[PDB]
């Protein structure tokens, strides 16, 4: 039979592929570039806009816009280009012929689902569609029916308690620090060493520095005193032009903002104390099963030592005889996609799709009626 497409609109990356695949066939940054300079050479072959790896390759010439920030689609004309590029160029598949499983972060604006459906049925004429909560898929991806999923993307972080396959929608925490606010903080702290990264293309050097060289301290004050007292933590990297830059105690300081959002001037508590405050909203019979099965998800949880720092600092909060366990599979970057791939292949799921007949009858509001 025709497979469903499985597609995840991260803030940072698009992951897309076919249901039943073990890993996504297309991954590329969900970025749209436009040329910002005078076109001197006649006959070069101009282009109105680049997408994905094309916009990465040219990025010295381009202004780069992200069309999703904080999991909200903030201009639709770019996002529709990104989907057009996903179906026609990266997967090379007719969207006429396959169901599409989309994905969304919880508690985000209602209009985002209406539009995200309308564009699938009017523009792409997809046969049938669904929209699934990110943190729900990471349980399919990690072989579990019970857990509290901490999921952190480029744009949003959220906790979703799930016990025995029931979600607890009053206990869902959403927190708005993510890889992009780590990157913008990392530029500000890098300024302390004189390195200044200014433009949208130059930000995405800093993003690669963050990915390669950041790690989370297991005691922030002890490693602060160490790296203030020793070169041993100081490490160095080449910019694209071959300039070398050298990065010390600062490389742990930026992911520490996940645990102390006051560095960014954010109100809230960090991901650990929002995890514990999420478990404290659940019924007392299930907390013992939510103290195990803490599932890490999404790229912002890929930092070395973040699982150990989580286990340590939840263990400082939870009662002394609850077994705290953090579960962090090495593929957790893709776990939302893997869980979408599992979900879209179940036969019990094939009744769940929103078919075009139903959208024609009801209009886009149906997506709230026939879905979580």
């Amino acid at each position: 039979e025709t497979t469903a497409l499985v597609c995840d609109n991260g803030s940072g990356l698009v992951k897309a592929g076919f249901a039943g695949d073990d890993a996504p066939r297309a991954v590329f940054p969900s970025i749209v570039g436009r040329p910002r300079h005078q076109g001197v050479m006649v006959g070069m072959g101009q282009k109105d806009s680049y997408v994905g790896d094309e916009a990465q390759s040219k990025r010295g010439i381009l202004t780069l816009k992200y069309p999703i920030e904080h999991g909200i689609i903030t201009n639709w004309d770019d996002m529709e280009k990104i989907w057009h590029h996903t179906f026609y160029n990266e997967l090379r598949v007719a969207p006429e012929e396959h169901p599409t499983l989309l994905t969304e972060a919880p508690l985000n604006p209602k209009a985002n689902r209406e539009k995200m459906t309308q564009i699938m049925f009017e523009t792409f004429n997809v046969p049938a569609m669904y929209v699934a909560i990110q943190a729900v898929l990471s349980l399919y991806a990690s072989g579990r029916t019970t857990g509290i999923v901490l999921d952190s993307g480029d744009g949003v972080t959220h906790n979703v308690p799930i016990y025995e396959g029931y979600a607890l929608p009053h206990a869902i925490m959403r927190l708005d620090l993510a890889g992009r606010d780590l990157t913008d903080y990392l530029m500000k702290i890098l300024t302390e060493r004189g390195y200044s990264f200014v433009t949208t293309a130059e930000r995405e050097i800093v993003r690669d520095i963050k990915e390669k060289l950041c790690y989370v301290a297991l005691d922030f004050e002890n490693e602060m005193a160490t790296a203030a007292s020793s070169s041993s933590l100081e490490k160095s990297y080449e910019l694209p032009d071959g300039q070398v830059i050298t990065i010390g105690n600062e490389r742990f300081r930026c992911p520490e903002t996940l645990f102390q959002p006051s560095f960014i001037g954010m109100e809230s508590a960090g991901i650990h104390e929002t995890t514990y405050n999420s478990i404290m909203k659940c019924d007392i019979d299930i907390r013992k099963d939510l103290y195990a099965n803490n599932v890490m998800s999404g790229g912002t949880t890929m930092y070395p030592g973040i699982a150990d720092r989580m286990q340590k600092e939840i263990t400082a909060l939870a009662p002394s005889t609850m077994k705290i366990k953090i579960i962090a599979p090495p593929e957790r970057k893709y776990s939302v996609w893997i869980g979408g791939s599992i979900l879209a292949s179940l036969s019990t799921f094939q009744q769940m799709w929103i078919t075009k007949q139903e959208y024609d009858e009801a209009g886009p509001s149906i997506v709230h009626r026939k879905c979580f």
Binding site: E69, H70, I72, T74, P109, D176
Partner: peptide
């Protein structure tokens, strides 16, 4: 968003 944040 529409209020408490830029998106």
């Amino acid at each position: 968003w529409x209020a408490x944040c830029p998106a």
